[PDB]
Amino acid sequence: QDLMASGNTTVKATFGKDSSVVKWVVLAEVLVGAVMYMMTKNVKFLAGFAIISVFIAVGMAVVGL
Amino acid sequence: QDLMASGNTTVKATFGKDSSVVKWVVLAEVLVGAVMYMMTKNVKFLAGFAIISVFIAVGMAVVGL
Amino acid sequence: QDLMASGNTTVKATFGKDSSVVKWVVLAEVLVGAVMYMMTKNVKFLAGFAIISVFIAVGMAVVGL
Amino acid sequence: QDLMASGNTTVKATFGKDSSVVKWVVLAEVLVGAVMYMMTKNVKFLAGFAIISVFIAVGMAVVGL
Amino acid sequence: QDLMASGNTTVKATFGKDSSVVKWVVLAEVLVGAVMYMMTKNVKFLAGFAIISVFIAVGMAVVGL
Amino acid sequence: QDLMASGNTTVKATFGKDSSVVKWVVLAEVLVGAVMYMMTKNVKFLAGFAIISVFIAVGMAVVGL
Amino acid sequence: QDLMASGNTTVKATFGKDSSVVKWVVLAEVLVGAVMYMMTKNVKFLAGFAIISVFIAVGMAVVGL
Amino acid sequence: QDLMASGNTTVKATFGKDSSVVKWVVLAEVLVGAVMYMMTKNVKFLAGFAIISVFIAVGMAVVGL
Amino acid sequence: QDLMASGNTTVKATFGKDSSVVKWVVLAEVLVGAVMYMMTKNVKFLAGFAIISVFIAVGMAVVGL
Amino acid sequence: QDLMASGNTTVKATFGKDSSVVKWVVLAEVLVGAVMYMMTKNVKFLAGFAIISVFIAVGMAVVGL
Amino acid sequence: QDLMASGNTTVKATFGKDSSVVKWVVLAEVLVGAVMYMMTKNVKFLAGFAIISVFIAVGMAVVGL
Amino acid sequence: QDLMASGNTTVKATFGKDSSVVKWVVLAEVLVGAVMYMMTKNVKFLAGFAIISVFIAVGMAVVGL
Amino acid sequence: QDLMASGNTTVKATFGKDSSVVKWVVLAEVLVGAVMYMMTKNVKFLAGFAIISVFIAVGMAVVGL
Amino acid sequence: QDLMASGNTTVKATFGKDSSVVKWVVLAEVLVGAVMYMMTKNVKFLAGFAIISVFIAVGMAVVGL
Amino acid sequence: QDLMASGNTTVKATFGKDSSVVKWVVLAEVLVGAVMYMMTKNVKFLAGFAIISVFIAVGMAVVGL
Amino acid sequence: QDLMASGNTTVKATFGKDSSVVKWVVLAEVLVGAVMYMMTKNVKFLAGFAIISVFIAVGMAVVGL
Amino acid sequence: QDLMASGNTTVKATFGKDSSVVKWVVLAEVLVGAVMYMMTKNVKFLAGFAIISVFIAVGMAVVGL
Amino acid sequence: QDLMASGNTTVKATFGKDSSVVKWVVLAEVLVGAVMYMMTKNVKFLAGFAIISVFIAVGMAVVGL
Amino acid sequence: QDLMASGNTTVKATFGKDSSVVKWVVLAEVLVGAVMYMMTKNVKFLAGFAIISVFIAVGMAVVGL
Amino acid sequence: QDLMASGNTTVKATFGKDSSVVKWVVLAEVLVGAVMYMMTKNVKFLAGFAIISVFIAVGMAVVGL
Ligand SMILES: CCCC/C=C/CCCCCCCC(=O)OC[C@H](COP(=O)([O-])O)OC(=O)CCCCCCCCCCCCC
Ligand SMILES: CCCC/C=C/CCCCCCCC(=O)OC[C@H](COP(=O)([O-])O)OC(=O)CCCCCCCCCCCCC
Ligand SMILES: CCCC/C=C/CCCCCCCC(=O)OC[C@H](COP(=O)([O-])O)OC(=O)CCCCCCCCCCCCC
Ligand SMILES: CCCC/C=C/CCCCCCCC(=O)OC[C@H](COP(=O)([O-])O)OC(=O)CCCCCCCCCCCCC
Ligand SMILES: CCCC/C=C/CCCCCCCC(=O)OC[C@H](COP(=O)([O-])O)OC(=O)CCCCCCCCCCCCC
Ligand SMILES: CCCC/C=C/CCCCCCCC(=O)OC[C@H](COP(=O)([O-])O)OC(=O)CCCCCCCCCCCCC
Ligand SMILES: CCCC/C=C/CCCCCCCC(=O)OC[C@H](COP(=O)([O-])O)OC(=O)CCCCCCCCCCCCC
Ligand SMILES: CCCC/C=C/CCCCCCCC(=O)OC[C@H](COP(=O)([O-])O)OC(=O)CCCCCCCCCCCCC
Ligand SMILES: CCCC/C=C/CCCCCCCC(=O)OC[C@H](COP(=O)([O-])O)OC(=O)CCCCCCCCCCCCC
Ligand SMILES: CCCC/C=C/CCCCCCCC(=O)OC[C@H](COP(=O)([O-])O)OC(=O)CCCCCCCCCCCCC
Ligand SMILES: CCCC/C=C/CCCCCCCC(=O)OC[C@H](COP(=O)([O-])O)OC(=O)CCCCCCCCCCCCC
Ligand SMILES: CCCC/C=C/CCCCCCCC(=O)OC[C@H](COP(=O)([O-])O)OC(=O)CCCCCCCCCCCCC
Ligand SMILES: CCCC/C=C/CCCCCCCC(=O)OC[C@H](COP(=O)([O-])O)OC(=O)CCCCCCCCCCCCC
Ligand SMILES: CCCC/C=C/CCCCCCCC(=O)OC[C@H](COP(=O)([O-])O)OC(=O)CCCCCCCCCCCCC
Ligand SMILES: CCCC/C=C/CCCCCCCC(=O)OC[C@H](COP(=O)([O-])O)OC(=O)CCCCCCCCCCCCC
Ligand SMILES: CCCC/C=C/CCCCCCCC(=O)OC[C@H](COP(=O)([O-])O)OC(=O)CCCCCCCCCCCCC
């Protein structure tokens, strides 16, 4: 008797591991990092996209959708 | 002579430990954390999904539904 | 010559220490706290369910139903 | 020559210090306070049942039934 | 010798668990919630249809028509 | 003996899943979001139309008209 | 038996993909961005008109008017 | 059946490519840059008017008024 | 044998699609919107006359006078 | 057989495009904007009289008095 | 048949281009600017009276009283 | 028919070129500059009273009271 | 054959342009404005007596007593 | 034939230019300003009594009692 | 014929130049200044009691009670 | 006829020159200064208690309680 | 021939300057002010009893009983 | 001939200087201040009980019961 | 003739010097201070429980319950 | 007659010296210190867990639960 069971499918494909939103977030990270590195010359901005990637992976395994 | 005993079943499966609402809350946490980390570069946002998980567990054992 | 003595039983089992209404109130507290913590990142919301629990206990001993 | 002297007994046991109505009023106070605290997070609602209790005591000593 | 026994049938099918009025009430809830969420951006409006559903169920079991 | 059975058809096509009112609500959401994003520059307004869409779907399956 | 079918045409041409309101919103974005960049010298304001454009496109395909 | 078609002309000549407001914005940029360069001696302020100019051009071609 | 058939003509020209009352209502809307926008500076008042117009159209087609 | 046709003339000259009320509204806008700019130093108040002007024009063409 | 034509004269001399209210507004601007410059040492306050002057001029030509 | 013409005299002598308020503002500038120079040893504070003086002069000629 | 012609004189001097009632209304406005300005510090109260004056003038010319 | 001419004298001396009420209003202004300045340290409160004084003067000349 | 002339005496001695309320206000200023200086180490708080004193003097001469 | 004359005594001994509150303020100053000097090694913190002392003296002579 | 002259004495001592009712009103004012100040921390409540006192005095001199 | 003289005694001992109500008000002040100081860390809450005490004293001397 | 004398006992033991509420307030202070010190590293939070303790003592001696 | 005596036990074991919350606070301190030391290389972060420990001890002895 679960009254919100009908939506998982949609959610899983719009906000999920294989979805467009996630790729847009990672693309934004790349561009922000490049623009900041040009202005400050600080190496901490060259790792940005890596730490996010691993993070997202570890996250989606805890939800189990 | 308990007059609201008939509903527990439904409640327990719609708002419970094994329910879709809880997974949607945790998914929202992941996405909010990623978007905030991209804009501020602050590490406090990388722990978000963990502290929530433990919290929910400790909560559902106190209700005992 | 008490004219409302016949109802205590029912009341005590519908609005009492061992009743479904109380568990629904505590469950609502858990869910509200999680949703608020996700949006504000403020630790005051992680204690909610504890303070309510003790409160209810201290209350039901003063009524003595 | 008091023409309403016959009823005190009944009144004293239905609307009195040791009566069911008073316990139902205090129980309602507990429940209202918990539900309001969950929605507002304001501490003024955690004192409700105390101030009522003392109040009722001081009242019943002035009537002297 | 029950003088209003003839009507239950009609009532049970016009104002009952399986009736059109109940579905119209739940539909109104959905639409009101969507319109309010668009104007305020407050999440309390996304739960509306669930709490009503459970409520109606628990109600119709107490009447026993 | 259901006395309001004659109207479902009309209702289902005027206030339903495939109806004009729903599309006008979603269009209003798009426009409100764009105007607010221009003035505040806050990303929470870029998700508006998605969360509403899923919501409506999950709603219309619970009514079953 | 749809009772509001007569208006779509008008709506689609006044609040639509090819309408004047949308162009006025995008023009406002350009001007706000220029005035803010002059006062703060922050590059985040140089992307404004792009993100809005894509957004509107993705929106109008979900409504399907 | 476009109900706001009558205004484009006026808008296009008051808030447009060939309008006085745009020239006042660029003039303000020149003056702000000179005053800031005098106080800080930083070369980033000598490019201000160029980047704005190109920006406005690219903007007005996307609106197509 | 319709006993009120003689009046439609008059009604249709005094309270109708092409009548003076409707234009006075729309004129009042324009003036109220301008006066409110001057005092609050809120954009919701700039759409008033549009939503009314479409509304009236959709209405007069349902009456069919 | 239009029973309110006699008044348009008067209305059109008292509440119209060429009327004193409209000029008083625009004058009030100028003065309010100046007084607010003096106290806050915010540029949004320097555009007030323009947006109103265009608005009124677009309005009076939809009424067609 | 203009019913408010009798007042323009008075208005034009009390709230107009050559009126005392306007001079009091500009005087207030001068004094506010001096007091703020003394406390912050920020040059943006030295232009205040100029931008207001031009503004008022451009305004009074659009009203045409 | 100017309805606020009676006050200029008073205003001109209380908030004017030859008034006490202006001298108090300039005196405050002197004292603030001395106290700041003692703590920072920065020469920009030794010009304060000059730039204000010229400013006030140029201001009072634009008001023409 | 006008049956109420005898009273105009009296009316015109008791409720008229040159009458005591009007001066008492304007005096009340002055006092209310001062008391409100002292408590709120809002400038809208400093214009009160002006707008009323013009209003009364424009009114008495429309009656023509 | 003015029927309320007998009272002006009294009014003019109780609610007038030379009356006690006006002095009490100005005294209240002084005290409110001092108490607010002590708590906020904002200079806008040091001008209060001046602006009121001029205001009252300009008011009493328009009434002409 | 002044109807509130009887109270000046009392007022003048309770809310006046030589009254206890004024001394309590100045004492509060001293204490607030000391406590704030201890926490911030900012010299603007060492002048507080002086500026208030002069202010009160200049005020009481304008009321003339 | 001074209506608040009865309290001076109490005030003068609780908030006065010879009172405990003043000594607690000076003690707090000593402790804050020592803790700050330990962390920054800046000599400006070694004068704190002196400047406060003189200040309080000069203050209490202006109140004259 | 005054037909109600016999009662003044009684009235003057029950509702008068030296009567118990007046003291009860002033006592109520004190208590209300204290309770409100405790809950809001707003200084306007500390003046209550003073303004009432003067008021009553000025009132009883106008009646002359 | 004072008709309410019989009650002063009772009033004076229930609502008076030496009464329980006053002590309960002061106790409430202490507790409210402590709870607020814990949450905000603002020193204004540490003076609460003092200012009330003096206030009550000054009040009871004006009533003279 | 004190009508609320019967309650002091209860009050004195529930809201008093030796009561559980006071210990819960001090415990809350300890926990809040520790959590804040962990996040900010500011020493002002290490004194919290001391200043409250003394405060409560000084308070309970002024009430004298 | 202590009305909240029933809860101490629970409180003492959930918020106490031997409780899980305290250990979680100290664990958080360790982790925050390590992460900060890695990024800044400042030795002040290596003492964190010690100062907290002593603090908590000294606190729990003052409450005496
Ligand atoms: C729906 C369409 C999505 C389209 C995705 C394309 C994204 C392209 C973004 C490129 C922007 C580059 C701008 C930039 O680098 O400026 C630097 C600023 C730094 O500002 P700050 O650190 O000084 O406060 O950086 C910032 O502060 C933030 C600016 C960038 C944030 C906006 C992008 C958010 C999109 C996230 C999508 C969420 C979808 C639900
Ligand atoms: C029923 C369908 C549920 C679908 C669940 C999908 C959720 C996907 C959400 C992704 C949104 C990402 C937006 C974002 O990151 O923006 C950042 C903002 C921060 O705003 P602020 O901190 O500046 O005030 O973040 C915010 O402030 C909050 C924005 C996100 C909150 C909306 C999500 C709430 C859904 C909870 C479901 C409750 C169900 C009863
Ligand atoms: C009879 C069936 C009971 C079913 C119980 C299931 C409860 C599940 C509730 C989950 C709701 C989550 C919504 C949420 O978190 O939104 C946050 C808002 C906060 O609003 P605000 O602070 O901005 O004013 O939060 C709020 O403001 C309040 C929203 C939640 C209140 C509704 C729940 C009340 C049920 C209490 C039952 C009483 C029974 C007599
Ligand atoms: C004879 C049988 C008695 C049974 C007693 C059981 C009582 C259980 C009550 C639980 C109700 C909880 C509902 C609740 O908390 O909602 C909050 C509202 C607040 O409304 P508002 O503040 O926004 O106006 O709260 C309210 O506004 C008031 C709602 C509660 C009032 C109804 C209870 C009155 C019973 C009193 C008995 C009198 C007997 C003569
Ligand atoms: C017999 C045919 C039934 C047809 C059912 C279709 C229902 C469709 C309703 C859609 C209406 C949407 C309007 C809306 O969302 O406006 C918001 C307002 C909120 O007003 P407020 O909160 O500001 O006071 O919302 C409101 O305040 C209430 C407006 C909606 C209430 C009217 C619907 C009641 C129908 C119930 C049927 C009962 C049958 C016995
Ligand atoms: C029947 C014809 C329907 C036609 C549909 C076209 C809708 C087009 C709407 C475009 C309006 C844009 C205005 C806007 O963005 O202003 C922002 C405001 C925000 O106000 P606030 O947040 O500051 O209180 O936003 C608001 O607060 C709300 C303003 C918009 C609400 C009005 C639209 C409601 C239509 C819903 C239709 C219901 C049908 C039953
Ligand atoms: C119907 C005729 C439409 C005419 C369209 C022409 C638009 C031209 C607008 C140019 C305004 C430039 C002003 C400006 O840049 O000031 C900056 C402010 C920023 O304020 P803030 O960030 O400090 O709160 O910016 C703001 O905060 C917002 C100010 C701009 C908002 C007003 C424009 C809204 C028009 C939207 C049309 C909706 C139609 C339904
Ligand atoms: C309608 C008439 C328009 C007249 C146009 C003439 C503009 C002349 C402006 C010259 C101002 C020079 C002042 C200056 O350089 O000071 C520097 C400050 C920097 O402040 P900050 O960086 O320290 O926060 O700079 C600033 O922070 C901003 C100060 C300048 C902003 C005001 C100009 C805005 C006019 C835009 C017109 C919009 C029309 C809708
Ligand atoms: C026949 C003799 C006439 C004597 C004329 C002398 C008038 C002197 C009036 C001075 C009253 C000042 C009181 C005041 O300022 O209080 C403010 C209140 C505001 O109340 P609110 O806004 O909070 O609802 O303000 C108000 O709300 C209204 C209070 C004032 C209204 C009473 C005056 C009406 C007289 C009009 C004469 C009509 C003759 C037919
Ligand atoms: C008939 C006898 C008249 C006696 C005149 C003596 C007046 C002495 C008044 C001194 C009061 C000082 C109180 C004070 O400064 O508190 C500040 C508050 C501010 O409140 P807020 O801004 O936070 O809403 O300030 C306020 O909000 C308003 C409080 C003061 C208003 C009351 C005085 C009104 C008297 C006007 C006389 C009218 C006669 C018709
Ligand atoms: C009738 C008896 C009068 C007794 C007079 C003795 C006054 C002694 C006051 C000493 C209080 C010291 C408290 C203090 O310094 O705290 C600082 C706060 C600053 O708060 P903030 O700036 O952070 O908002 O400071 C504040 O924000 C304000 C706190 C002080 C305000 C209360 C004193 C008002 C009394 C005025 C008397 C008016 C009589 C009508
Ligand atoms: C009623 C009992 C009074 C007991 C008096 C004993 C006072 C002992 C205080 C010792 C505290 C030492 C703490 C310390 O030095 O920390 C440094 C901080 C500096 O903070 P910041 O500069 O980084 O913002 O310093 C601060 O920022 C401020 C912290 C100290 C302020 C609290 C003391 C105020 C008491 C004043 C009494 C007023 C009575 C009405
Ligand atoms: C004949 C015996 C008289 C005995 C006199 C003793 C009076 C003692 C009164 C103490 C009551 C304290 C209660 C209190 O402070 O509560 C605050 C409320 C405020 O309510 P609100 O502002 O939120 O609407 O305050 C109020 O709203 C009003 C509550 C107080 C009003 C009742 C007192 C009226 C007595 C007047 C005597 C008239 C005799 C003809
Ligand atoms: C007859 C028996 C009397 C018993 C007296 C014992 C009193 C004990 C009270 C302890 C309550 C502590 C609660 C507290 O501190 O919460 C803080 C709130 C602040 O709320 P806010 O500022 O956010 O609106 O604080 C408040 O807003 C107000 C809450 C406290 C007010 C209730 C106490 C009133 C009793 C007055 C007695 C009057 C007798 C006629
Ligand atoms: C009846 C049972 C009582 C049980 C007592 C146990 C208390 C344990 C409390 C531990 C809470 C720790 C939470 C915490 O430290 O979070 C920090 C926040 C700071 O918030 P902010 O400064 O950012 O606005 O801190 C806060 O802002 C406030 C959060 C803590 C306030 C809630 C505790 C109040 C209880 C008082 C009892 C009154 C009884 C009448
Ligand atoms: C109920 C389950 C509890 C689980 C306990 C496990 C705690 C593990 C925490 C590890 C987090 C490490 C994150 C970190 O080091 O980031 C550094 C930031 C510094 O931020 P800032 O200084 O730049 O403002 O650090 C911060 O600013 C603060 C981030 C850490 C604060 C969150 C932990 C609070 C838990 C307290 C429990 C209270 C229970 C009532």
| 3-state SS track over A1-65 | CCCCHHHHHHHHHHCCCCCHHHHHHHHHHHHHHHHHHHHHCCHHHHCHHHHHHHHHHHHHHHHCC
S41/S32 Cα distance (integer angstroms) = 13
Give the other-Cβ count within 10 Å of K56's Cβ: 16
The answer to whether the CB of M29 falls within 8 A of the CB of M50 is no
I42/G59 Cα distance (integer angstroms) = 24
The answer to whether the CB of K43 falls within 8 A of the CB of L51 is no
Test site for ligand 3: of E29, E51, E60, E62, most ligand atoms within 8 A of the Cβ = E51
Test site for ligand 7: of J41, J51, J58, most ligand atoms within 8 A of the Cβ = J51
Give the other-Cβ count within 10 Å of R41's Cβ: 14
C-alpha pair distances (Å), I46 with each of A48, G35, I24, I37, J48: 44, 23, 18, 8, 13
D58/D62 Cα distance (integer angstroms) = 7
- How many angstroms is it from N32 CA to the middle of ligand 10? 7
* C30: nearest CA partner in chain B: B59
Pairs of residues, one from chain C and one from chain D, whose beta carbons lie less than 8 Å apart? 55
Query: Any idea which ligand is nearest the CA of R25?
Result: 14
Give the other-Cβ count within 10 Å of K37's Cβ: 21
Ligand 12 lining (C-beta closer than 6 Å) = O 39; P 21, 24-25, 27-28, 31-32, 35; R 43, 46-47; S 43-44, 47, 51, 54-55
Contact F24 G5 (CB under 8 A): no
K9/J2 Cα distance (integer angstroms) = 38
I32: helix, coil or strand?
Answer: helix
| H or E, element range at N33 | helix N20-40
Residue with tokens 């200012």: R51
F59/G56 Cα distance (integer angstroms) = 26
Give residues with Cβ within 8 angstroms of D11, minimum separation 6.
Answer: D65
Give the other-Cβ count within 10 Å of J20's Cβ: 20
Q46/Q30 Cα distance (integer angstroms) = 9
E51/E55 Cα distance (integer angstroms) = 6
F47/F56 Cα distance (integer angstroms) = 15
Ligand 13 neighbourhood includes Q34 CB (under 6 angstroms)? no
Residue of Q10, Q20, Q43 for testing the chain R interface, max R β-carbons within 10 Å: Q20
Q: What's the angle, vertex CA I45, arms to CA I44 and CA I50, rounded to 5?
A: 95
R and Q in touch (3+ CB pairs within 8 angstroms): yes
DSSP assignments along J13-60, one per residue: HHSSSS-HHHHHHHHHHHHHHHHHHHHH--GGGGSHHHHHHHHHHHHH
Which chain K positions have a beta carbon within 8 Å of L49's beta carbon?
A: none
User: What residues in chain S have their Cβ under 8 A from chain T's Cβ atoms?
Assistant: 9-10, 13-14, 19-21, 23-24, 26-27, 30-31, 33-35, 37-39, 41, 46, 49, 53
Round the CA-based radius of gyration of chain I to a whole number and report it: 16
The answer to whether the CB of R47 falls within 8 A of the CB of P14 is no
The answer to whether the CB of A33 falls within 8 A of the CB of A48 is yes
Contact N26 O52 (CB under 8 A): no
Ligand 6 neighbourhood includes F21 CB (under 6 angstroms)? yes
As a whole number of angstroms, the longest Cα–Cα distance in chain R is: 58
- Residue closest to F65 by CA, chosen among E30, E23, E53: E23
Give residues with Cβ within 8 angstroms of C56, minimum separation 6.
Answer: C17, C22, D30, D34
- Token code pair at residue F21: 């009112």
Q: Is K6 exposed, middle or buried (0-12, 13-18, 19+ CB in 10 A)?
A: middle
How near does any CA of chain H get to the CA of I26, in Å?
Answer: 13
The answer to whether the CB of D38 falls within 8 A of the CB of C25 is yes
O and P in touch (3+ CB pairs within 8 angstroms): yes
Ligand 1 neighbourhood includes F50 CB (under 6 angstroms)? no
The helix, strand and coil proportions of chain S, stated in percent and rounded to the nearest 5, come to 80, 0, 20
- Residue closest to F37 by CA, chosen among G54, O19, O2, J21: G54
Q: What's the angle, vertex CA M27, arms to CA M24 and CA M29, rounded to 5?
A: 115
Residue of O37, O42, O45, O65 for testing the chain P interface, max P β-carbons within 10 Å: O37
- How many angstroms is it from C32 CA to the middle of ligand 2? 14
Give residues with Cβ within 8 angstroms of A64, minimum separation 6.
Answer: B23
How near does any CA of chain E get to the CA of A16, in Å?
Answer: 21
- Residue closest to R22 by CA, chosen among S15, Q39, S63: S63
- Token code pair at residue A44: 């901490």
Reported as half-sphere exposure (CB side, CA atoms, 13 A), residue R56 has a value of 22
Contact G3 F10 (CB under 8 A): yes
Test site for ligand 9: of M27, M29, M31, M32, most ligand atoms within 8 A of the Cβ = M32
N34/O22 Cα distance (integer angstroms) = 9
M31/M49 Cα distance (integer angstroms) = 10
Q52/Q50 Cα distance (integer angstroms) = 5
Residue with tokens 């900060």: T36
Residue Q31's identity, in one-letter code, is L
O29/O52 Cα distance (integer angstroms) = 9
The answer to whether the CB of O65 falls within 8 A of the CB of O13 is no
Contacting subunits of C (3+ beta carbon pairs below 8 A)? B, D, T
L7/C1 Cα distance (integer angstroms) = 84
* E50: nearest CA partner in chain A: A3
Handedness of CA E34, E35, E38, E42 (dihedral sign): negative
How near does any CA of chain J get to the CA of H5, in Å?
Answer: 8
R61/S5 Cα distance (integer angstroms) = 24
C-alpha pair distances (Å), T4 with each of C29, C55, D31, D46, D47: 23, 10, 17, 12, 11
Test site for ligand 3: of C19, C24, C52, most ligand atoms within 8 A of the Cβ = C24
- Residue closest to Q48 by CA, chosen among Q28, Q65, Q20, Q63: Q28
Residue nearest to ligand 12 atom 19, measured at CA: S44
How near does any CA of chain N get to the CA of O4, in Å?
Answer: 7
* J21: nearest CA partner in chain I: I31
Reported as half-sphere exposure (CB side, CA atoms, 13 A), residue F6 has a value of 1
Which chain E positions have a beta carbon within 8 Å of F64's beta carbon?
A: 23
O46/P55 Cα distance (integer angstroms) = 8
Long-range contact pairs involving I30-33 (C-beta distance under 8 Å, separation at least 24):
I30/J56, I30/J59, I30/J60, I30/J63, I31/J15, I31/J21, I33/J55
C-alpha pair distances (Å), H33 with each of C50, D22, G20, H47, K45: 58, 77, 36, 9, 17
- How many angstroms is it from T25 CA to the middle of ligand 16? 9
- How many angstroms is it from D28 CA to the middle of ligand 3? 19
Which chain L positions have a beta carbon within 8 Å of M53's beta carbon?
A: 3
